[PDB]
Amino acid sequence: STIEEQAKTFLDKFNHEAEDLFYQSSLASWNYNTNITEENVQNMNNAGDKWSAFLKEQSTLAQMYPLQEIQNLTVKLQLQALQQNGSSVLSEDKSKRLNTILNTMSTIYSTGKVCNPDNPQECLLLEPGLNEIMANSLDYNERLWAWESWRSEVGKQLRPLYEEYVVLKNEMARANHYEDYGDYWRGDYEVNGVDGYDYSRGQLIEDVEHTFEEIKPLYEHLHAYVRAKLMNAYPSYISPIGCLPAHLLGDMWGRFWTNLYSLTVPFGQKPNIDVTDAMVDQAWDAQRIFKEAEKFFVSVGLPNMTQGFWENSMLTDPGNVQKAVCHPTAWDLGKGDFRILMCTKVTMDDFLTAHHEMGHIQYDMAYAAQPFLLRNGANEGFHEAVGEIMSLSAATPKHLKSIGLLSPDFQEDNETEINFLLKQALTIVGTLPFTYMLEKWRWMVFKGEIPKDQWMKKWWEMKREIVGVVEPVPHDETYCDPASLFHVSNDYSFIRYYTRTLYQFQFQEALCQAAKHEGPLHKCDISNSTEAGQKLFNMLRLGKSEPWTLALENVVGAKNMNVRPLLNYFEPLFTWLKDQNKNSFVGWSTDWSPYA
């Protein structure tokens, strides 16, 4: 008989129970986070696995449906989302050991302990402390010692676990008809629907290389400038012919270069824009911050947050034994419940964090009309892009001036704009090559092109070739540097942090295009521009209902993820660097080493 018409009844039956079950589970998790106490633990757990106990049969029941002839795009998409069996494709004896090995790597990576040889009774962890040892310090011996200790006492035991984790994950992918698990990560970034918007899993590999060669000159110039500043700070330790070490970047893995901003200040006479003291003088509390964050969203055209968010959600000051987590998060519990979990203070960083959380919350309610299974973004890089857009547009000095927070008689010039631009670049453009390198290495080690013995040497060689960083100490095959990272052993995709950035400026540019502004991209604001409210909403009101290839068409001119505005956002910085590093050779040579 017919199968297409009887799948709708099953979909509705599943969704009706899933809505309130997920609502109750999320409410239990929210209660546990808001109240850090034993009473709210078991119940939360009593929900969690219970949802899993409900997610299997609905996945188990999604095998009798031959999803190869249903002509309804939305119904087919929902059935395909429900048809993924997950980890229920391998044998139980291997599944239990995979779960055990995942648990043990999660526990071991979070309990790294390194003791100084001179004082063997003082071991530290990834918690601030050992992190603070090199987070803010001007030294070469202690930073290198901490790096070596971390990569020898946390980078050694994770390697054998990762060795079997790779093969088991690849075999699971093969059981899921994936030749490699990179395809599993690239399944979401792929659509097989309307003609003309088709995308393939293998297209991402070539397209990312296509979109990475246009920023190489700017990254080389910034690398040369950072190297020259390091020479001015660390004499006779960084070779002009070579490049900078890994521990001197500012982070143990080079993910962020913010720690090196103080050592690479172009013009120290002009201070950075700070109005925190002004906020204190103006008596700005958490409520004032939260209501000022609302004006920016409502001046573009976005609706107002409904009643209950100010009441049900925790806002500030957990205070006494009623402990709550201060990590800023936005929770969409469903059935019209949206909440924020953050600790507010008087800080422009806190203002930007509140704006980011409001952007996430607005994006979440934007696709609220979608069913339970479709209230998700097209890709992982859309939520963060939307959140960062409002932080970008609220960092303009014009916005602070217009909201009565900066002096109307301000005399901002090119020097302070360049300083803020470089401060921003040390965080945004300085992490794209490292994320690229990590994702590429993970994909190529999951593909099995290299043997088991060619693991560390190739990783380090590509680090010198792409990032332009040499080895602080020689590394043998028994070590494992990638395993000493959060998103390498927790099964988290790392390309998520890359494409989003490629969108952000793009979106901003398009939003700037819909801003009636002339001049630099960084200065233009989406505030006081209602026309951009609906256009952005076109991507907000879709979510998973439409493919990302189709989604990237109502705001930006081209659906391709070509990184055009990156070279123009830092245009004053680029033309200043062209007039700065004339006497320093740009690039790096992969023969010089700190150890020899």
């Binding site: 018409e5 009844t9 039956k13 409904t306 059935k335 419940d337």
Partner: protein, 98 residues
């Protein structure tokens, strides 16, 4: 904790007629295979209970609805309302509607 005492019909072969109330609890059969009063491969329960909670947003809260439908059969009218009247003024030539 979720008020599950309010139920709504979710599955039925055909729609309701105007001013019709159906309280049938037969196991709906979306597919072709008959079920002997049990759920299964294509059989589901027509009635589903709500999970209303005070934390539910606007549009998901419980809402009491009363519909007053007037009938005007040829029998003499019985439901007639406001009989607003004026004051009694006498000793003046006036028109009246007692």
């Amino acid at each position: 904790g979720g008020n599950y005492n309010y139920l709504y019909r979710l599955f039925r072969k055909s729609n309701l007629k105007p001013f019709e109330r159906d309280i049938s609890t037969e196991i709906y059969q979306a597919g072709s295979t008959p079920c002997n009063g049990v759920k299964g491969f294509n059989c589901y329960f027509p009635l589903q209970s709500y999970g209303f909670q005070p934390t539910y947003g606007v549009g998901y809260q419980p809402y009491r609805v009363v519909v007053l439908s007037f009938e005007l059969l040829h029998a003499p009218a019985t439901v007639c309302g406001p009989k607003k009247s004026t004051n009694l003024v006498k000793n003046k030539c006036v028109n009246f509607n007692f």
